[PDB]
Amino acid sequence: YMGNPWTEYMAKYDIEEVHGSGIRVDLGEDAEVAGTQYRLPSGKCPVFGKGIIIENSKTTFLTPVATGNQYLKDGGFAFPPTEPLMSPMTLDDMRLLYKDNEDVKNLDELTLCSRHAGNMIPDNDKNSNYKYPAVYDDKDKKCHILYIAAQENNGPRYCNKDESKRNSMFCFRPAKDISFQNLVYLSKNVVHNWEKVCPRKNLQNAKFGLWVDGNCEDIPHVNEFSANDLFECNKLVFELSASDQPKQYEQHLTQQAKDIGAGPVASCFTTRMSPPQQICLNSVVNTAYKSHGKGYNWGNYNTETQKCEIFNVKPTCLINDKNYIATTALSHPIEVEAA
């Protein structure tokens, strides 16, 4: 074939190319709102099974952000109610909302959710390119626009883990956790044909390799870790994967906040898509480094020896092996299909 026969199938595993941003923490672009610059998610692939854990809270992150006189920790990350309604929104209501937008009405549910989230422009800057990320719940078929685009915050200086301090900034981190298995984390850039060009399911009886001299050889170096099941391996790969989070702390609070993706304060919005329309929150919100996709994004899970083999070089072929399942940080942590 005068070339690597695996090329078409393996294109979706070139995560620098097809995703192009962090996975664990995605903050791969910057956008301005009225002369202030903010970090925001920019990955082109959906991230299956990713949610945000809020430390020492029973409140889940898809809960609306605290508004009005609510305490910060009694809320989550999601858009609060708006007039007219925007989030959360069922797939069916999204299609109705955009029925007269030709280029949007028939998008697949994930791309539609992303475009829906990206419709609102903070009303302080009509020309802003700031677009909020979203989470789609595949079980409920419901799109949640995220008001908070930050994905990790830690350090006693920058958050407070104490449950009795209700209005102090909470600590949080991204995770693949069974409670998030039906969630899909979506940046503003998710491509319309993700079904074809991005990973989703784990590959049964296959392990990643490199195409060398007309044969598929093992990845030259892998890091082998104990992992009891495939889900645990997917979690380990996710934790090691491309990340746009700062590795250190900035002394100044406002600089650290910017660096972790603190965003604009908006109470009203306009729309990118016709018809032009004002959208306002029901209640105002509580007042209280780029990987470009490079990292340890891939794993070969040995189901016999219970070893997660994690590596940071893009794979270019598959090896048939009934003891292996091939995973990526983008992949769903449970779903599998045959190679």
Author numbering: 105 to 392, 420 to 470
Question: Can you quote the paper on this entry?
Answer:
A fusion chimera engineered using the HP41 AMA1 sequence was ultimately selected for structural studies based on yield and stability of the recombinant protein. The structure of the Fusion-FD12 protein incorporating residues 105 (2nd residue in the chimera) through 470 including the inserted PfRON2L sequence was determined to 1.55 Å resolution. Clear, contiguous electron density in the apical groove of Fusion-FD12 enabled unambiguous tracing of the entire PfRON2L sequence. Structural analysis revealed that the Fusion-FD12 protein adopts a conserved architecture relative to the structure of the previously observed binary complex with a root mean square deviation (rmsd) of 0.61 Å over 252 Cα positions. Moreover, RON2L in the fusion and binary complex overlay with an rmsd of 0.53 Å over 34 Cα positions. The core interactions between RON2L and AMA1 are retained in Fusion-FD12 including R376 of PfRON2L (R2041 in PfRON2) that docks into a pocket at the end of the PfAMA1 apical groove, and P368 (P2033 in PfRON2) that docks into a pocket formed by Y142, Y234, and Y236. Overall, all the AMA1 loops (1b, c, d, and f) that pack against the C-terminal end of the RON2L sequence are highly conserved (rmsd of 0.21 Å over 76 Cα positions) relative to the binary complex. In contrast, some differences are observed in loops 1e/1a that pack against the N-terminal section of the RON2 sequence. Notably, the sidechain of E136 on loop 1a is displaced by 2.5 Å and no longer forms a hydrogen bond with the sidechain of N233 positioned on loop 1e. The loss of the hydrogen bond may also be responsible for the observed loop displacements, though it should be noted that differences in crystal packing between the fusion structure presented herein and the binary PfAMA1-RON2 structure may also contribute to observed shifts. Furthermore, many of the sidechains on loop 1e adopt different rotameric states with N228, N231 and D229 showing relatively similar displacement (~2.9 Å, 3.1 Å, and 3.4 Å) while K230 (~7.2 Å) and S232 (~6.9 Å) show significantly larger shifts, which may alter epitopes in loop 1e.
